[model samples]
Target: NYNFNEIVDRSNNFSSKWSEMEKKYGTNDLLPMWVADMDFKAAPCIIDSLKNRLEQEIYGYTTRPDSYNESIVNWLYRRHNWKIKSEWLIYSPGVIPAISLLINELTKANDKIMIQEPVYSPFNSVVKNNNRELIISPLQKLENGNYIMDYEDIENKIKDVKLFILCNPHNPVGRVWTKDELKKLGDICLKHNVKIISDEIHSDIILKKHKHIPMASISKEFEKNTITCMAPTKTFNIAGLQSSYVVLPDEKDYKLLDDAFTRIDIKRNNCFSLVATEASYNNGESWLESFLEYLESNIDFAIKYINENMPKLKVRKPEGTYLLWVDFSALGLSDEELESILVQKGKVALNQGNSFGIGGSGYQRINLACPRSMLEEALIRIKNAIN
Candidate 1:
């Protein structure tokens, strides 16, 4: 059994997810579980790497070494069966920033970009912030709680859109899109000549029964047309370090994106980011596997608790990611009422479902990437308030 009871206090760590709970939800004691960041500590190996870097005492400009590239390349090969060369990699501080840059670099101002709705909210902001038109192609949720791509809508959207921002193993809903789904998506993009930007940051945390396919790895054509963003930031809890890669296969696309970064005087890796990323990809696999096991167990626990005690709330077990999407429409509360009750009455800080997109109005996203005991306590508090 995984030792998931080692409670780590994040309240003093300036954690945006933990420390800001009071200000965000009006109560310091409200359990903070909205953000996607895990409540767990970084892997021991990654911590050691950072410690070593800190001991050096010289925090100067640093270049990403061959070792960093090797770790990234080997990680892709080992985990996703994607063989990527050093030349194909582009570095950015984070995926969201990279997404913004990609939009500016790949599309013109006033051009349209399409994203699936009920996704991570930042995708919409990234498009709007760059003076581009944001288009939504919402996924259709089936009766069984599984979501399917709306290919007809996607195809139509891509006809005039310049870019398609894809959330691989999508956020909020937590569906690790199947290969068939990716293929259909690729076919549509190819037909319409739309550039694909696949954010696979949650690629490594896939649940036991499902597998994640790196969008570009499916075919040469897919690779050529796609910009695949990946990072150890999500997997190893190193987001603060701000290091991630954008795998670009086509030399033309690479130069275009690289030029955008150069204009802004941005180069891929920083000293701390390089050290943490290399350690995570090269040495943190077992820790990651253990963490995934813990998360899957947490998800199972949450689903059962919600069903048995809060039957009005419906939750579908996620095929991937540590996030859970709970549909609360059955409670017959308006979005405002549902969110207000969760924060004010239930004393829980969950991502308001409406923040994701229009289709997310009656749901909430729960971050289950924490100690099982803490999760249990949070659920008990909500159950008590509801009852």
Candidate 2:
């Protein structure tokens, strides 16, 4: 029995989601339903591992434990049924950094990199910041509010694109791509010879029936052409731990990324991140199983409350991630007004839909990873403001 419903005291801490928000809102008064991290505490096992490591003295530059690599490889095999040799895993400080490194070192400047929209937002600037062209192939949003990839459009635009960044178990808009869907995506990329970098960061938190297929595992061709980034950070409330890795099957792709790391002098885990990640993957599944159930409950509670109390808005329940991509276009508010009201009047701090890209304008992504009480309160705030 996990206390997922238990609200921990994050209000007075240096938490990016909690304490520092006053910088944005001018007060630490709004409820934190905006950020991706959970309000729940980390698992006892995860905390225990960190605590055990902390008790020891000397925080020196560290080396990667073979056991650490073994744990990661074993977890992948056990959790996703993806067989990966330990050598295939490359340590990345985080996904975004790894992506930036790849763009900087591998692809030439002014090359076009394609991403599906309204994606993780960073993909837009990440490419542009490197002097590369950013191409957007948006997902098709259904009348039911679910989003699907626009495969034909992607194919039509595939010419001259050097890379495609895919968000499986997609963010902001949550769509867990089916194996068939992945195969189709892979086939297109293979035909065009466009490389894929699949961010599977949120894969482990999947809601009941959805599954995350590693982009590399699609086939030999995909394995040769893809880089998969994953971490226990999002899964175990360990983002502050800064632990993540990328998987590359082809030695050529591996060497480019590996060389980039060496060129920059980037290397192994900090002491805390090392133990925390190993513990979460090796011993964290029980907590996650219960946590996902709680996440689904949070979603159900949010949907029922929003549907019943705020008819002008609609909820896009996720297949993964403790987030809800909500539609507020029915209320006819401009993007500026939509965010203004949520922060100023509603006293909530949801991500501005426009931040995610063009298709995101009429929508706001709400995080459903907190206690139900907090979610209901945020719901009431929106209703009181909008109604």
Candidate 3:
């Protein structure tokens, strides 16, 4: 049995989530609940594979065997029922970097790109960094506090947009878009000739009954128009390993991407990441199966605690991902005051919502991937800080 409740000491781990909190929060003394990585250890299968590779003592250039690709193909079908050929995969260090490369290769300078906000902050920064104009359609919030795509806003903005970046199973706001919603969005993108680059890095973290439908896996037309980026790093808590892959369905786009990486010389995987990815896909299911139950319970506990103890704060259970999008607007604190209190009074580190852009004000994205004790302590800190 996996001990997901076991809290490993991360003080010496050089984790950005742990060690670097001071840079963001102005002090590392606070309990860190920011960033997306889990506090749990990597799966035993993954650790074992890395250990076996380390025993060789020869860390040299590596080439991936056919089995590497085969494992991913099998895992996708096994988990998401999304059938894809091995030829479509390309290596990338991370999802945002891959999206940056695609932006440079696919669109001209200053062309408009559309993304839904509040979204992962990098989606905003990367587009702007590439000198492209950013177009944002704020995700429409429902009466029940769920967020959905505003097709009218998207249609209004789609005219000159050359590309669209979609966050499937989403980040922070955590709404796993349904098939009908995806199909409708795809239809609009097709009508406007805007290519979709869907980031599905959080695909495997399906909470309870919600299923992750890859944007490309919808149909042939959707498949042709979409490019997907996925990784075992987020799924298996191996983000430090720095491994991810991109799916390009068309040969022309594939050749362009292949050529770009070839010129840039980011050709192969780091030795440790190679083995960890295969092991995670092939054998880490049981660990993940148990982890999901633990994670969902953490979500339940925190939500119930917040509802009962801090009546002024509003939060809804997310359909997928380990982030809880909490509304602190009712407390009527300015964003700066809210952030200052959490760090200074609460002694907790949480992502300030405005960083996600537009609709994110008066909210905080609380990461729920840690042990239950840590989660409870952070919730208590919030309660005590405000009271």
Candidate 4:
């Protein structure tokens, strides 16, 4: 029993999603529908755990506890049917930084790294910033708004690439990759010795009868050749606490990644974040289930509303994630004009498609991880702006 309808006042709470909108849009009137960070109150269990830890009254250096690893390991097995060893788990403050660290340590300067285009924008900058040559492989988008891997394109690029960042339950365009898809990709990478760093932050919010197959969980070789980035942040709405880690398969890459963490001064010591993550992993699954139901309903309602009210703009409900990948080609507006209309006319904030690169042009990604009321208002504003 969860109340997804409750309205929480996120404004003036130092939330970048809410408080920083005006700074970017030049008005406090813009409704937030940008960042993945949710507006709902953290689940009761997570809040209670944080409070209990706060009562300890001392925030100091902490190490990853046995229970912390156990919780993560158990949750993976229970939630995704993937067995992971506690020793394989390594901590990071956040996934984005983890990618930068991975790029820096796992590969050499000018060594090529590959990411699917029209995917997460950060993946682009992280690779480039860390001295890796970036390769963008565009995904094959179907007429119905679903996207699939272009295995041939990936194979062609893997020849020179040293690492690949796979976004499971992909952001921007939501597609919880199937096991078959992962296996084929893994085969191609392994053949070419391209190590994979799977950004599976959105894995926990799957829908559309799709199953999230951990790229590392598919086979023994795949496990050894992969580093899985996972966190309680995105799924549990504890992103601000920055609870994140990478699942290593006890390989040479693990040593390199761990060293990078040390070099970057990541001591894994968010005392409160550690406790909140463990508590959620062990005690927050029910809340997650309920949260997914609410999130799915919001997506359904938004898709129906857009199709009915704004025929020019198109979006198919995604397989997972609270982000919507909407096509605005029908509106025939350039990226700049579409964005301007949303900010100036609609009074809503959403990520521009071109920010995601290549295939992202003529599309906009909206955050649906808000209360239904917020989602409705944002959708209505968007419809009015275009129609």
Best by TM-score: 3
lDDT of 2 by residue, 137-251 (tens): 9999878778899998999999999999999878988888899999999999999888899999998989988887888877777888888999999999888889899998888
Alpha carbon lDDT of each predicted model? 0.89, 0.87, 0.93, 0.87
Best by lDDT: 3
lDDT score, residue 374, model 4?
Answer: 86
TM-score of each: 0.97, 0.97, 0.99, 0.97
Q: Give the RMSD in angstroms, all C-alphas superposed, for model 3.
A: 0.7
TM-score of candidate 2 relative to the true fold: 0.97
RMSD of 2: 1.2
Candidate 4 ranges beyond 4 A from true positions: none
C-alpha RMSD by candidate, in order: 1.3, 1.2, 0.7, 1.2
lDDT of 1 by residue, 111-179 (tens): 999999899999999999999999999999889887888998887667789999999989989999999
lDDT of 3 by residue, 209-281 (tens): 8999999999999999999999998889999999999989988888888888888999799999899999999
* lDDT tens per residue, model 4, 1-387: 788888988766888888777776677678888888888888888999989999989888887779998999999999888998887888888899888887888788999999998888899999888778999889998776789998989977788998989999888889888888899999999899888999999889887588788999888889999899999988899988988889989568778888877776876758889889999999999999899988888989999998888888788889988899999988789999999999988989998899999799899999888889989999889987886
Among all windows of 10 consecutive residues in model 3, the one with the lowest summed lDDT is 18-27
The segments of candidate 2 whose C-alpha lies over 4 angstroms from its true place after superposition are: none
